[PDB]
Coordinates of C-alpha atoms and ligand atoms in Angstrom, one line a residue:
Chain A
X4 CA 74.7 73.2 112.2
X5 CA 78.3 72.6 113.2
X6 CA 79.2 69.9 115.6
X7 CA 82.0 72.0 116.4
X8 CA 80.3 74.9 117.8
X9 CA 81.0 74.7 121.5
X10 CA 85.1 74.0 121.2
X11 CA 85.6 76.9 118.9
X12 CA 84.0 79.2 121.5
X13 CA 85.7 77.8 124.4
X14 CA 89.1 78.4 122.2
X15 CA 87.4 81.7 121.6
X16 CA 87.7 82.6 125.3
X17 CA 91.3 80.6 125.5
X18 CA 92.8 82.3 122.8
X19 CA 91.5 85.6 124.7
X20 CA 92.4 85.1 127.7
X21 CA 95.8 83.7 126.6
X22 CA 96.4 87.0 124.4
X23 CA 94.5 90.0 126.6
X24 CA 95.9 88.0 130.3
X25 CA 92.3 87.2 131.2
X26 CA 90.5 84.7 133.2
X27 CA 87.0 84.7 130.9
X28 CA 85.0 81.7 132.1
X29 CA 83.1 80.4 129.1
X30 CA 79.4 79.4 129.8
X31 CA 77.8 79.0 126.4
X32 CA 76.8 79.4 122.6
X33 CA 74.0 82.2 122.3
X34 CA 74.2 82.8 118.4
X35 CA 76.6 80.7 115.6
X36 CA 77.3 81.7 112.0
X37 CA 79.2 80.0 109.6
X38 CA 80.9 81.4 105.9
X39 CA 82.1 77.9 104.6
X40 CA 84.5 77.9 101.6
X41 CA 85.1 75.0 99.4
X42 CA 88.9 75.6 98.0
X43 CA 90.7 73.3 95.8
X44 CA 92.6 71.1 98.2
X45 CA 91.1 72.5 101.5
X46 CA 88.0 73.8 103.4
X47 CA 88.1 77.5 105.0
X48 CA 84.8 78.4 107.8
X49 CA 84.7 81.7 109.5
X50 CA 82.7 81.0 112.4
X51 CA 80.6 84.0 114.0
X52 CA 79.8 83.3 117.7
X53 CA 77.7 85.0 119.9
X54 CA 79.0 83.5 123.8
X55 CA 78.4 83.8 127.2
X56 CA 81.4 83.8 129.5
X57 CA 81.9 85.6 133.4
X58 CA 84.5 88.2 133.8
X59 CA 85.7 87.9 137.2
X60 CA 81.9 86.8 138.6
X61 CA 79.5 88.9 136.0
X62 CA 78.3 87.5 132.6
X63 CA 79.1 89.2 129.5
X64 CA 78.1 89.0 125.7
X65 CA 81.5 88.2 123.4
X66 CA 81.5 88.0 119.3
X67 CA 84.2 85.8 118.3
X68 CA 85.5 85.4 115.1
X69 CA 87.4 82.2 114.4
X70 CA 88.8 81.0 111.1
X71 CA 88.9 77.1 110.4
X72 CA 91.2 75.8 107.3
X73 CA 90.3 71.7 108.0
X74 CA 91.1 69.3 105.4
X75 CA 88.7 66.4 103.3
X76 CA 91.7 63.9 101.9
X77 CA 94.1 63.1 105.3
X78 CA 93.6 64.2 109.4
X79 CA 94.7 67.1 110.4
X80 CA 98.2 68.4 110.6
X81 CA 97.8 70.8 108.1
X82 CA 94.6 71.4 109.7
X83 CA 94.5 75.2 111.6
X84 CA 92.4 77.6 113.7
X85 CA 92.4 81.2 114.7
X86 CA 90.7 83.6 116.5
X87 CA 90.5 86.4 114.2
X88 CA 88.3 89.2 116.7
X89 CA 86.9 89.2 119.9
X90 CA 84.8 92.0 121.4
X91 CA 82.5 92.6 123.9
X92 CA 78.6 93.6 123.8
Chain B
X5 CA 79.3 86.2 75.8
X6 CA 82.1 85.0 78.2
X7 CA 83.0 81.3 79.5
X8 CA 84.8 81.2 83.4
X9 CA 87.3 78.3 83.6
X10 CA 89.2 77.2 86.0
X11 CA 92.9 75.3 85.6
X12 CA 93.6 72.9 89.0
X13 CA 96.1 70.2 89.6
X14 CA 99.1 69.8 91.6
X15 CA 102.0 72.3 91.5
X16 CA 104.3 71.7 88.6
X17 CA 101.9 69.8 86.1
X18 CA 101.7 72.4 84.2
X19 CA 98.4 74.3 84.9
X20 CA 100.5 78.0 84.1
X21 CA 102.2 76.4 81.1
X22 CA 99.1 75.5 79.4
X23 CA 97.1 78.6 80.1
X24 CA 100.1 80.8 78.7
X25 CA 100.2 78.7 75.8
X26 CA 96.7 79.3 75.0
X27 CA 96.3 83.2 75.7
X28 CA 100.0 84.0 74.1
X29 CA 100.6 81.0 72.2
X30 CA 104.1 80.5 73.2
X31 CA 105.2 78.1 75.9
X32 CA 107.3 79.2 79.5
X33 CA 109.8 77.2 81.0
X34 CA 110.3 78.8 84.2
X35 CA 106.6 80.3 85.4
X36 CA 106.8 81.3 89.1
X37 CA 104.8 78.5 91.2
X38 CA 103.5 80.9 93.8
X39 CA 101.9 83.6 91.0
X40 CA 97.7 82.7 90.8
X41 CA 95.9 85.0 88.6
X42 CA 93.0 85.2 85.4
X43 CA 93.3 86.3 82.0
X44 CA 91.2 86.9 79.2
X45 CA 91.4 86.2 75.5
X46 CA 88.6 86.3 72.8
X47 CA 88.4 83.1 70.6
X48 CA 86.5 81.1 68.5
X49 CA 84.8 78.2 69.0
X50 CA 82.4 76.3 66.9
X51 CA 81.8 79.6 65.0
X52 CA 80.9 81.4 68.3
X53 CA 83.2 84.9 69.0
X54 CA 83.4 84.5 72.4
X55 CA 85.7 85.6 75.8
X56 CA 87.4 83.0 77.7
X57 CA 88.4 84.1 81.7
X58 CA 90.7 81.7 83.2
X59 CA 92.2 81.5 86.7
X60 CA 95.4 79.7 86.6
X61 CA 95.2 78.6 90.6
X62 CA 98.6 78.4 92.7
X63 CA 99.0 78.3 96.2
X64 CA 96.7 76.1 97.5
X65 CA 97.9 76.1 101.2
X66 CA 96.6 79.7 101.5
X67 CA 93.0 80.7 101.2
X68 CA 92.5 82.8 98.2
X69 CA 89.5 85.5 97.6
X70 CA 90.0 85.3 94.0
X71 CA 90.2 81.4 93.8
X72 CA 86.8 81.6 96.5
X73 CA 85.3 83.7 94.0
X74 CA 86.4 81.5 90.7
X75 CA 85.1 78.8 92.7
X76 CA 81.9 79.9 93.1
X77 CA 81.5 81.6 89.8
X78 CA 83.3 78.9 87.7
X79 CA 81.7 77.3 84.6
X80 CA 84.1 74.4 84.1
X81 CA 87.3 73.2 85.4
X82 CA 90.4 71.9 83.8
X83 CA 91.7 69.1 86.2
X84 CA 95.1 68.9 85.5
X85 CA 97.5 65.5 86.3
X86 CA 101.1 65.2 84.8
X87 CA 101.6 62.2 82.5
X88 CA 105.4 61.6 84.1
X89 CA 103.9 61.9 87.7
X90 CA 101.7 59.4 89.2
X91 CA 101.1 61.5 92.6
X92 CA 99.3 64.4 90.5
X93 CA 97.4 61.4 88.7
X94 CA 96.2 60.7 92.7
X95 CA 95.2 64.2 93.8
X96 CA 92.7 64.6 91.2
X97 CA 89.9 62.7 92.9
X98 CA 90.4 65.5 96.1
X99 CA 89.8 68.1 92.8
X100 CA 87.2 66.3 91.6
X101 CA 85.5 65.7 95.2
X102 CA 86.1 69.5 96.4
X103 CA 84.8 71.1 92.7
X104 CA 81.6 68.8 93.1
X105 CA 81.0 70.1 96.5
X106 CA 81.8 73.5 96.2
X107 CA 79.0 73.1 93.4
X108 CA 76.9 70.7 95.7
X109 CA 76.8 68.7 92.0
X110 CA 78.0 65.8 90.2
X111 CA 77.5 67.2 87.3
X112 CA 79.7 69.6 87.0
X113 CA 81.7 70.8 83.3
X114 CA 84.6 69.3 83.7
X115 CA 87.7 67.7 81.4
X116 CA 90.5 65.5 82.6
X117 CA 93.9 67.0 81.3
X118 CA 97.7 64.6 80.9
X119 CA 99.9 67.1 80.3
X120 CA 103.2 66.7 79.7
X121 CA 102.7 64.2 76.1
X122 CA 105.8 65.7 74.6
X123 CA 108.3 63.4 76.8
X124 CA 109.6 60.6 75.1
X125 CA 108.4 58.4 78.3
X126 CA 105.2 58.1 80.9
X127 CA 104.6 56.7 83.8
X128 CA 100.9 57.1 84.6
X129 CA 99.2 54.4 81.7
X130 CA 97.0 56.6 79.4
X131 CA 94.3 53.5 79.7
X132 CA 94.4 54.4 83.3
X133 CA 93.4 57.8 82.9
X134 CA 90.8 56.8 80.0
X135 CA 89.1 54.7 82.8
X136 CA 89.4 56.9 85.8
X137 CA 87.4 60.0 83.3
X138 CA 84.9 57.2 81.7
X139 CA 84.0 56.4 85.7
X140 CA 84.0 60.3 85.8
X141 CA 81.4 60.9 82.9
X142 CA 83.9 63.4 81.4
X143 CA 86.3 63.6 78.6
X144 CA 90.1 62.7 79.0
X145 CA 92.1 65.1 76.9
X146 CA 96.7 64.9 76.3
X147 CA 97.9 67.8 76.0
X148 CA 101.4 69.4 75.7
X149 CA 102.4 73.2 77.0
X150 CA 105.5 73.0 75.4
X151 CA 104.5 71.5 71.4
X152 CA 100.9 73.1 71.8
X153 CA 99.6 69.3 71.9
X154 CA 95.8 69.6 72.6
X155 CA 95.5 73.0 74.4
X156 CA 92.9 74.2 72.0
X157 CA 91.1 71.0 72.2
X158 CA 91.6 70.7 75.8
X159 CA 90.0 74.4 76.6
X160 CA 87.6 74.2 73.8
X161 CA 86.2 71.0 74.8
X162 CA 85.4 72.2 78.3
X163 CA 83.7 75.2 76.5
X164 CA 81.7 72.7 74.7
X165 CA 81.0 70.6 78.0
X166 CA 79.6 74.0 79.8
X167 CA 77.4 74.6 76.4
X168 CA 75.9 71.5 77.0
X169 CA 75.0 71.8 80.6
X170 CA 73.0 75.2 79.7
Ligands
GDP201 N1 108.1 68.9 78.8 C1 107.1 69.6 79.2 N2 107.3 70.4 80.3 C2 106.3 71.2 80.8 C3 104.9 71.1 80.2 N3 104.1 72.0 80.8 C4 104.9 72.5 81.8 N4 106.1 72.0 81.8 C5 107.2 72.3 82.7 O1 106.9 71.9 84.0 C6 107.2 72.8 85.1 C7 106.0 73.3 85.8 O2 105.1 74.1 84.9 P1 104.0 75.1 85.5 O3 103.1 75.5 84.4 O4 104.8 76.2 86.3 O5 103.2 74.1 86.5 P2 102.1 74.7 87.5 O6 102.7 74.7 88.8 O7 101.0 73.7 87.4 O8 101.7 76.0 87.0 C8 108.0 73.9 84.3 O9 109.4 73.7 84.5 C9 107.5 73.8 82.9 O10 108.5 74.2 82.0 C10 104.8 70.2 79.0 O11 103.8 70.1 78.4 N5 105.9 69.6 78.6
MG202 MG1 101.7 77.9 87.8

């Protein structure tokens, strides 16, 4: 349902590779689950991705957690994202 | 039977100073800002014995389970602007706007709150904020923490907004 999807798995893999000194190619979106919450000034998402990426040649399953706090009243700034968990399956 | 409120505005208009004032019924100068939590106190209202729970929210840069669950669970909000501070008076349409959506409602039990009616001066015109609830389809109540000024009637009349959206 996000339009969003996509980018926060290919900061998924980033964020990973950044973090764990990996080379991850990111290929695509398999599964995508989203816990919104509505807070009084903000908006938090955890985003639960299910991705494809090649490790070194061979393609490999990855959930991601990523947590979102995005604000509704002025662009980003004190917008923020975070990859929370990343493991293979 | 119990009625779950929820006290928002801007840091320092108040929101601690009134819910203190109408669970101990004394007023705090100095309450710290950072320090969100609920209480409880037994009233009545309209002849009804009943249980208030109120979450006094703080800290609204960090994500909060307990606010996440208040705003899920809530009844009715207290949006709460200072009547010396016009930038509070601004931020409650983001309130308004989130409390809708978290509810996916319009309709949502709700009471517009100037706090602060003690001070000899205002800057934010009470006319203003009479027009800005009347667009709202709520009530506008003043209250002040520190001479009691419209708590009751404040919380009370939120309690009577839920009651008539059940
Ligand atoms: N004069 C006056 N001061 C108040 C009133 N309510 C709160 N204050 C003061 O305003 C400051 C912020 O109050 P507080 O309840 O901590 O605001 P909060 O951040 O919304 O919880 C404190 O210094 C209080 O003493 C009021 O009705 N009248
Ligand atoms: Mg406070």
């Amino acid at each position: 349902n996000s339009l969003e999807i996509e980018e926060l798995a290919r900061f998924a893999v980033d964020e990973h590779n950044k973090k764990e000194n990996a080379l991850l190619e990111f290929v695509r979106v398999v599964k995508a689950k989203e816990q919104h919450s509505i807070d009084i000034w903000y908006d938090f998402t955890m985003y639960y991705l299910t991705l494809e990426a090649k490790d070194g040649g061979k393609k490999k399953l990855y959930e991601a957690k990523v947590w979102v706090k995005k604000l509704n009243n002025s662009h980003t700034y004190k917008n923020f994202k975070e990859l929370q968990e990343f493991k293979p399956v | 039977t119990e009625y779950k409120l929820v006290v928002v505005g801007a840091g320092g208009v108040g929101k601690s100073a009134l819910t203190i004032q109408l669970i101990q019924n004394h007023f705090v100068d100095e309450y710290d800002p950072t320090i969100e939590d609920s209480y409880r106190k037994q009233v009545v209202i309209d002849g009804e014995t009943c249980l208030l729970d109120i979450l006094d929210t703080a800290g609204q840069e960090e994500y909060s389970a307990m606010r996440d669950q208040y705003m899920r669970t809530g009844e009715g909000f207290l949006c709460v602007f200072a009547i010396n501070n016009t930038k509070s008076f601004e931020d409650i349409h983001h309130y308004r706007e989130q409390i809708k959506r978290v509810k996916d409602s319009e309709d949502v039990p709700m009471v517009l709150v100037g706090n602060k009616c003690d001070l000899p001066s205002r800057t934010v015109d009470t006319k203003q904020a009479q027009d800005l609830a009347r667009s709202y389809g709520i009530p506008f109540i003043e209250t002040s923490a520190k001479t009691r000024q419209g708590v009751d009637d404040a919380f009370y009349t939120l309690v009577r907004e839920i009651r008539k959206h059940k």
